Design goal:
Oligomer: part of a larger assembly
Order of helices and strands of chain C: HEEEEHEEHEEHEEH
CATH superfamily of chain A: GHMP Kinase, N-terminal domain
Number of helices of chain A: 4
Main location (chains F, H): cytoplasm
Shape of chain C: elongated
InterPro entries (chains F, H): ExoRNase_PH_dom1, ExoRNase_PH_dom2, ExoRNase_PH_dom2_sf, Exosome_comp_Rrp42_subfam, PNPase/RNase_PH_dom_sf, Ribosomal_Su5_D2-typ_SF, Rrp42_archaea
Protein name (chains F, H): Exosome complex component Rrp42
Number of strands of chain C: 10
Helix content of chain C: 25-40%
CATH topology of chain C: Ribosomal Protein S5, domain 2
Largest sheet of chain A: 5 strands, mixed
Number of helices of chain C: 5
Keywords (chains F, H): Cytoplasm, Exosome
Order of helices and strands of chain A: EEEEHEHEEEHEEEH
Radius of gyration of chain C: 19 Å
CATH architecture of chain C: 2-Layer Sandwich
CATH class of chain A: Alpha Beta
Organism (chains F, H): Archaeoglobus fulgidus (strain ATCC 49558 / DSM 4304 / JCM 9628 / NBRC 100126 / VC-16)
CATH topology of chain A: Ribosomal Protein S5, domain 2
Helix content of chain A: 25-40%
Distance between the termini of chain C: 47 Å
Strand content of chain A: 25-35%
CATH superfamily of chain C: GHMP Kinase, N-terminal domain
Structural class of chain A: alpha+beta
Largest sheet of chain C: 6 strands, mixed
Bound molecules: zinc ion
RNA sequence: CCCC
RNA sequence: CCCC
RNA sequence: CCCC
C-alpha cells in the first residue's frame, strides 16, 4: 500500500513481463461436452461447454447460424467477503463481452438453429478471473470439438507506479493506475486480431500502444500452455482407444 | 507429429482439397478442430479429438414417434448409434409405410404407435427411415389405454396391469433396453 | 425432450438387470461408490471440501463473518446452508434462482447438520445481544452423476471440519478451529417397486425420481429423514431400509478417520 | 419449558396417544370444484381443488397423464408475527413434497394433457399445519370427485421429555426432540403404504419404528372424520335432489 | 348403506365388471370415487358425489368455431349440456358441411363463422358434430366487418352498428342467452 | 379463450334480461345481496373479520407491531393494506405476485380508510419520531362471486373495529381497542351502457369488467371514487349513481349495529 | 413545510384564481423514431409521450382475434421528483397505467386492426401535481399525431379542494395540504365534452361538491383541448410545408 | 425478423457506399454530426443537461443527498450511474429496466467519470466515516438515432458541470457549484472490414453492432476503452483509430467550453 | 405505506 | 454503486 | 437461516 514497485520487482516477486503460475487441464467433467480446469495464480476456474444442442423452448433460434450463450458465475466462497449468489451487473456485463469474443471465432454458420452454451464458474477469485475464465472456456471449446477459426487467449496488462505490468495481481489492481484485459485470436502460431479489449485507467497514447505489445507476449506464453493441455488430452483419447 | 490445433495452417487451397475438420480463408486451408491431421489423395481432413456426429444414409438411429399422420409416421430422431454425443443434424425424419417392413403393410398405425420409441436405419436423406430389417423396430411402447409400458410376449405386445394387447413392428431388442 | 429418449431406454436396461437382481455396475444394493474426501480445496474460504462419490463431485466452501443474531434467538451463532446446481453440473440445468430441487438439497444438508447439533451454535456468540458469528455453508455441484445429496452432506460436514474462524482481521481475537461435535451423514436410496438401491447413480435415476434419505449422527440416532418423489413407500420396505441405511452411515463415517 | 409431560399428561391435558380436536367440513366454496375447511388444534386451513382443466403452456402438459400442482400458502395473519406474502424456501418445499403425496394416488392416467390444481391456505396456523393442509386437501379432492386409489391421511408424531406423542402442539414442536409428519394411503379402511414421510430431530432406530405405529393409529382416527365429512356431503346432495322434487 | 369411499373394496374382478367409478388392481375391484355403489347385472359402478362429464355420442354440446376449411368446420368444444363441470374429453370436434341442415350447402361459410358460438349434437367420437336440428346451430355471431354482436331478424342476422346482414345456420336459442 | 364460450352465453342472458329491465336474480338495480359480517374469526390475529356478500367470501386479518415512522412524518404511524386474490376463488386466479387487480383492490380499500381518516394514527405513537405502531391490513379472498372489492372494504373496517393493540406482548402497557372514528363503506356498480347494476354477481360480471366505485364516510361525504374498465361513463348516469351510492352506503352502514 | 394558508385574499399560493390552469405548452411530433410523439409541459410538469403501431404482437397468445390491444406504461424518471426515486414499477405506477390504458380503450377504434398492438409510452421528466393528467393529455396528442383512428379526443384535468374552495388544476402545495384531489378525463367530440373516460378521487368531498367539481373540470378540459387542437394544427402545417417542401 | 428485413436492405446500401469509401450522408469518416448541449433542462434537479446529437437525444439528471459511504472508503462520497433505454427511444427497447445494454452504457459512462477523477469525492464529505454526498446520475434516452452512448457521455459531463450541491436544503451550509476537475469525452466508432466510422448512425448500425469506444480526459490521456460486438479488431486499425479518436475528443471539448 |  |  |  505504501508503494507498488520496490527495486523493480512487484510485491510477489515477479518481473514486469512475467505471468503468474498457470495450470490447465482439459476434460475434467464427465457430464459435459468439453471442459477445462485452470488456475492463474490464485484464480481457480472451470469452464464447461454443451452443444450444439437443440435450442428451446423455441423461437430464440437463429435459422442461418448458431447462437452462443455464456454465463460467468462467481461462487459465494470465491471472494474475501462472501458474495451473494446471483448475477451482478458486473456479471451480466462480463458475460456479454466474453460471449462476444467467441462469436468472432466459433464457426456458428456450421450449426443453424442451435445453441452452443458456455458456462464458467470461478471457484476462487483473484485479480484477473475474467481473464482466466476466457482461457478456460477456450480450452473447453476445443475440448468439445466445436469448429473454430483458431484460439482465444487472454491476458490482463496492468500498470503500477508508472510502469506497465503483465497479469496484474490484486494489490496492483487496487492501487494501480490501469487495468486492461485483452484477448487475441491466435491463428497459425501467431497473434492476429483482437477479440476482447477493455481498458479503464489513466494511460497515454504511447502507453496504450506499448501495453498492447506487453500483452501479446503473455498470450503466446499462455497459448502454448493451452496447446500443451489439448495435446495431453489428445494422448489420452489416443491411449483409451489403443488400450 | 500429425497433431493440430484449430488455427494451425495446413496449406494453400490450390494445393490441398478441404475435408472434414478443415476451413479455408484467403486461399489457405486451416484446421478447425484439434486432432490428427490426415492427408490422402490431396484431401486434407482432421480427425477431431471430439467428433460431432452427423446422421447420414446408412446409419442406425434412435427415435420417438411424435406424430402419426396417414401412411406416415414422423419420428423425432435423437441419437446416432455408436456415438454418445448428440448429433448436429437431428430432428424430424419420416417413416413411410412402404419402408415400415418388407412384407406389405396398410394403415401404418398397426406398426408404429404414438410416442413409441424406435430403432431405425436411415435409408434416404432428410432422415427418411426404414424399419424393414429385423434389428430395426419399436423398442418400447405404452398401453394405448392405461399408458403402462408394454411387455413383449411372443409376436405381440401385452399390457400387464390392463391385459390389453397391441400389434407392432417389433425390433428384436424390444424391452432389452439396448439398441 | 429428445434427451428423454436416451433415458427411457437406459431405464429399460436398468429395470432389466433389477429384474435379474443386479445393478448395472455390479454393486450390492446396499453398496456406495468409491468415496474421496479432499479438504482445503479453497484457500481464501475458511473451510472447504471437494468430495467425489463415483463420478459425481461437489464442492462446498465455508465463509464466516460477524452479524446480528435472530431477535427471538440470541446467544446462538447462525448457520446458513445454500446450494447451486449450476449450468454445467448437468445438461439439464437452467440458470437462475434455485429451482425447487436446488432448495430441498440444501434444506436436507442443513437439517442433518442442525438436528445433530453438529456445530456448537452457542460458542459462536460475540456480543450476547447483537454481535454473533455467521456460518455460510455454500454447496456447489460440479459433476452430477447421481446422488449429489449424499455427496453434499458429506462434503459439507467435511468442510466445516476444516473451518478456521477468522477472528483477527475482524479484531475479535486469534484464529481458532470451529467446534464440530458430531458427524451428520446421509444415506439416500432409489426405491423401485419393492426393492431399493442405496446410493443411486445418474444412470439408475432414469428409472425415476423416487428416493428415501435417512441421516444419522455419530451415535446411530436417526436425525433427519426425507421421502421424495411420487410413490407409495412400503412400510416393510421402509423398516428394512432403515437399518441398512443407519449401517451404511457408519461406514461412511469411518472414512473420516482417514489414516 | 419446565417439563412437557408430568404425571402422564401434556400441557393441554392429552395423553401421549390422543389427537387434538378436529373439525372437517367439505364442499364449502362455490367456485372450486371441490373444497374443504379444516380445523386441527388451533390450525385453520381451507383447501380448493380445480380440475381437470386445460393446461398451458402447451409444453408443460403430459401426453399421457394429468399433471398435478399444489400450492401451500400461509396468510400474513396466520402466524404470531405477520408473515410477508410470497414463497419462501419452506413453502417451495412443502408444496413439492405435498404434491408428490398426491401424485402417488390420483389416477392421472384418466386425464391426459391436463392439470389438477390443488390450492391450500392456512388462515391460522399452529403446530402441524402441513398435516392439516394434507387432510383438508384429500377431502377436497374427494369432494371434487377426482379419482384416487384411496384416501390420503396425515398426522405427525413428536417427541417430548423422551416420550413419543401423537399430534404435537406448539410448545412441543418448539421444545421437543423430534417432529415427524406422516401421510398414509388408505384402502379398505386399512393403512396400506406411506405417502409422506419427513423427520427432523433425534430418535433411536427403535423410536422411528415405534413412531410409525403411533402415527398409524392416529391416522386411522383422522381418516374416520374425513370419511364422515364426505358422508355428510353425500347426504346433502341427495337431500337437495329431494328438495327440487318438493 | 350403498355409500362407498375411494379405496373401498367392492369385490373380486372375477365377480363383477369394472364400470364408471371403479378401478381394478391385484384382482380386486375398488371404488375410485365417493358416492353410491350400484351393481346392476354383474356390473359394479359408483355414482360420483361430483361427476366429471364425458362427451359421447348423443350428447348436446356447445362450442366456438376456431377454423374454417372448405369441406369441414373446426369447432373448439368446451361444455356438455347437463353439468357445469368442464368435461374431461374437451377439445376440437368437427363440423362437416353435410351435417348442417338436411339440405345442400356449398360452403360452411354459409352456415358457420369464425368466432361463432355453436350448439351441436355429437354424431360420433373425436367429437363429430351435427347441427341439422332446429335446436342446433349458431347461438351468437359477430359481424364479418366491424365485429359487433349481431341480432337475429327473423331468418337472418344483421348488426346494429354497421347494418350488414349475414346468413348462418341459426339456433332457435340464438340471442336467448340459453342453450 | 375456452373458459369464455360459457361466459359469452351468460353475458347474452344477463343482457337479454337488462333489456327487460331485470337482474338475473330479481334484485332491484340498487339492491345489495345478503350480507354477513363475522368478527374474531382469526384469534392469533390482532383483529379480524369474515364478510359474506352473497356467495362471495373474503376474510381480512389485522396485525400490529412496533416500527419506524415515515421519514417525512415522525408523528402518527402506519397502515399498510395488502390483498391476496390467490387461486382459492376463481380459476382465473393464477399463482404468484400481485396482479393489477390485487393491487387496485388493496389501494381502493386502503384509500377509503386513509382518506376517511377512520383511524387516529397520531394516537398509535410510541416514541415521537422513533417507535410507532404499524397496522397491517391483510385481505384474503376465499370465494369470488363478484364484488370482492366491496366485501373487502366491509371486512377491512369490521376487522379494524375489532382490533386489540398488542401492548402487553410488547412491554408497552395494557392492551386496548383500536380507536376507530369513522366507517368507510364503498359501493361498486357495474355500468353497462346507460344503466347501472349495484353489487354485481360474478355472472352479471360476464358482461364486462366495467365499473364505478364510490366510497363515503359517516356523514355521507364522498371520500374515494374509482372508475375502472374501458368504457365511457355518461355524466348523466354518473350523477344518479352518486346519489344512489351515498344512499346504499348508508343502508350498509346500519349493518354494523351488529 | 406546509403553507398552512393555501388560498389567501381569494388567490392561491402562486396567484392563480380558483379556475385558472397553470401555464401549458404542447409540442407535437418531437420524437423521430416513434410513430407519434408529444412533448408537453404543464405548470412544472414536463412529460413526453411516444406511440407505436398498430404493430405485430409477441407473445401473440396475448393478441386478440377481433380487435387491437392497447398498452400504456406511465413512467417517472428518477430525477423527476424531489427525492430521487427508484426506477421501474411501484404499485402506484401499475395502477395509473391500468387506468390510463382504459381511457383510450374507450376511444381508440381497436376493431380496425385485429391481432395488433397500439402501444403508448409516457415519460415524466419532471414531476409535479397532476402529472397523470399531463401524461394523459400528452398521449392523446401522440395518438393523433400517430393517426390512430379515434372516436374523438381525450383531455384531462384535476380539480382540487383548498381551504374549503374547489380549485382547478391543483399544484403541489394544494395537493399535499388540500382536502381533495380528483382527476378527470373526458371524451371530447364535436368541440364539446361528451363522456367521462377517466375518473378518480380521494379526500373528503360533499355530494354537492362532487358535481360542482365536474363542472369546474369540464371548463378546464375544453380550455386544454383547444391547446391540443392547436398542437395538431401546427403539425398539419408542418407536414404540409414538407411537400411543398 | 421481421423488422430485421428492412434493415438488411439498408445494410446493402451502407456497404455499397463503403465500397466507394464514402458514407450515406456524405459525412467524413472522422466527423460527428451536429452536436448541441443544453444545461439546465430540468430544474428541481441539482443537475441536468440534454444532448441532441444528430437525431439522437438524451437527457441526464444529477441528484444529490446525504448518505453512508461504502465499507472501504470512509474518506469520500460516491457516484452511481444508471441508465434506461426506454421504449420511448425505440420500438425494440424493453419496458422494465435493467436490460443488458442498459447496464453496459451506464457502466462505460461511469468508467470515464470515475476514471477521469473528474469529481472530487473527497470534497463531498459531510462528516468522515458516516456521511458524504451521494451523487446520482441517471441517463434517460429520449430518441435513438445511433450512438446514444457518446451522446450519453457528453450529456452526463454537461449535467455534472452544471450541478449545484443542495447543501442549503439539507442544513449543511450555502449551496455551491459542484467541484468538477476533469472532462471525460467518449468517442464510439463503428467498425466493418478494415474501415472505421464516425460516430455511427442508426442507419449505419444496420451493418452490425460491431463498435469501438475510447474515452479521453482533458490532458488527452485515455481513461477508458471498450471493444464491443462480435468481431475481430485488426490491430492496425486500432492504431489509427486511437489517434483519430483522441483528436475527435478535442473538437468536442471546445464544443463544450464556449 | 401514502404522496410526488 | 465500484472491485473481486 | 430455522420454525410457525
Ligand atoms: Zn393397459
Ligand atoms: Zn358490423
Amino acid at each position: 500500500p505504501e508503494k507498488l514497485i520496490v527495486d523493480g520487482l512487484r510485491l510477489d516477486g515477479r518481473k514486469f513481463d512475467e505471468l503468474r503460475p498457470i495450470k490447465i487441464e482439459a476434460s475434467v467433467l464427465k457430464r459435459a461436452d468439453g471442459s477445462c480446469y485452470l488456475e492463474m495464480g490464485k484464480n481457480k476456474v472451470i469452464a464447461a461447454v454443451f452443444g450444439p444442442r437443440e435450442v428451446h423452448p423455441e423461437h430464440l433460434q437463429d435459422p442461418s447460424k448458431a447462437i452462443i450463450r455464456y454465463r460467468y458465475n462467481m461462487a459465494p466462497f470465491s471472494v474475501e467477503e462472501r458474495k451473494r449468489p446471483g448475477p451482478d451487473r458486473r456479471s451480466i456485463e462480463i458475460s456479454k463481452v466474453s460471449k462476444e469474443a467467441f462469436e468472432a471465432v466459433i464457426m456458428k454458420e456450421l450449426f443453424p438453429r442451435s445453441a452452443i452454451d458456455i458456462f464458467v464458474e470461478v471457484l476462487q477469485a483473484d485479480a484477473g478471473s475474467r481473464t482466466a475464465c476466457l482461457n478456460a472456456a477456450s480450452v473447453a471449446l476445443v475440448d468439445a470439438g466445436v469448429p473454430m477459426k483458431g484460439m482465444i487467449t487472454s491476458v490482463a496488462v496492468g500498470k503500477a507506479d508508472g510502469q506497465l505490468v503483465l497479469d496484474p495481481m490484486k494489490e496492483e489492481d487496487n492501487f494501480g493506475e490501469a487495468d486492461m484485459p485483452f484477448a487475441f485470436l491466435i491463428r497459425n502460431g501467431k497473434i492476429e486480431s483482437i477479440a476482447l479489449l477493455q481498458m479503464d485507467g489513466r494511460m497515454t497514447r504511447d502507453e496504450v500502444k506499448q501495453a498492447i505489445e506487453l500483452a501479446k507476449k503473455g498470450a503466446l506464453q499462455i497459448y502454448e500452455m493451452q496447446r500443451e493441455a489439448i495435446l495431453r488430452r489428445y494422448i489420452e483419447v489416443g491411449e483409451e482407444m489403443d488400450e | 507429429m500429425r497433431f493440430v490445433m484449430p488455427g494451425d495452417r495446413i496449406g494453400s487451397a490450390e494445393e490441398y482439397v478441404k475435408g472434414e475438420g478443415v476451413y479455408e480463408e484467403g486461399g489457405e486451408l486451416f484446421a478447425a478442430v484439434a486432432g490428427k491431421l490426415i492427408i490422402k489423395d490431396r484431401v486434407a481432413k482432421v480427425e477431431s479429438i471430439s467428433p460431432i456426429p452427423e446422421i447420414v444414409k446408412g446409419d442406425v438411429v434412435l427415435g420417438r414417434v411424435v406424430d402419426l399422420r396417414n401412411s406416415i409416421a414422423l419420428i423425432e430422431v435423437s441419437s446416432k448409434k455408436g456415438e454418445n454425443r448428440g448429433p448436429s443434424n437431428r430432428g424430424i425424419g419420416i417413416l413411410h409405410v412402404s419402408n415400415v417392413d418388407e412384407g406389405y403393410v396398410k394403415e401404418i398405425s398397426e406398426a408404429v404407435g404414438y410416442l413409441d420409441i424406435l430403432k431405425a436405419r436411415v435409408i434416404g436423406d432428410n432422415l427418411r427411415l426404414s424399419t424393414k430389417e429385423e434389428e430395426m423396430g419399436v423398442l418400447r411402447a405404452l398401453c394405448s389405454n392405461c399408458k403402462t409400458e408394454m411387455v413383449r410376449e411372443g409376436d405381440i405386445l401385452k399390457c400387464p396391469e390392463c391385459g390389453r394387447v397391441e400389434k407392432r413392428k417389433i425390433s428384436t431388442d424390444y424391452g432389452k433396453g439396448e439398441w | 425432450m429428445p434427451e428423454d429418449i436416451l433415458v427411457d431406454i437406459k431405464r429399460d436396461y436398468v429395470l432389466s438387470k433389477l429384474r435379474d437382481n443386479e445393478r448395472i455396475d455390479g454393486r450390492g444394493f446396499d453398496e456406495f461408490r468409491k468415496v474421496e474426501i479432499i479438504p482445503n480445496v479453497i484457500e481464501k474460504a475458511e473451510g472447504s471440501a471437494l468430495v467425489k462419490l463415483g463420478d459425481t463431485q461437489v464442492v462446498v466452501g465455508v465463509k464466516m463473518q460477524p452479524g446480528e443474531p435472530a431477535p427471538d434467538t440470541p446467544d446462538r451463532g447462525v448457520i446458513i446452508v445454500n446450494a447451486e446446481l449450476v449450468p454445467l453440473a448437468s445438461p439439464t440445468f437452467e440458470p437462475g434462482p434455485p429451482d425447487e430441487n436446488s432448495i430441498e438439497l440444501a434444506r436436507v444438508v442443513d437439517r442433518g447438520i442442525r438436528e445433530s447439533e453438529a456445530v456448537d451454535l452457542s460458542k459462536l456468540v460475540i456480543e450476547e445481544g447483537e454481535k454473533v458469528w455467521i456460518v455460510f455453508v455454500d454447496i456447489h455441484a460440479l459433476d452430477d452423476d447421481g446422488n449429489l445429496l449424499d455427496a453434499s452432506a458429506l462434503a459439507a460436514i467435511a468442510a466445516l471440519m476444516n473451518t478456521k474462524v477468522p477472528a483477527e482481521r475482524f479484531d475479535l481475537g486469534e484464529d481458532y478451529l470451529l467446534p464440530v461435535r458430531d458427524l451428520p451423514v446421509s444415506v439416500t436410496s432409489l426405491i423401485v417397486g419393492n426393492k431399493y438401491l442405496v446410493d443411486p447413480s445418474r444412470e439408475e435415476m432414469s428409472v425415476g425420481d423416487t428416493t428415501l434419505t435417512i441421516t444419522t449422527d455419530k451415535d446411530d440416532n436417526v436425525v433427519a429423514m426425507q421421502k421424495s418423489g411420487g410413490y407409495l413407500l412400503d412400510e416393510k420396505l421402509f423398516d428394512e431400509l432403515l437399518d441398512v441405511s443407519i449401517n451404511c452411515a457408519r461406514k461412511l463415517r469411518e472414512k473420516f478417520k482417514e489414516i
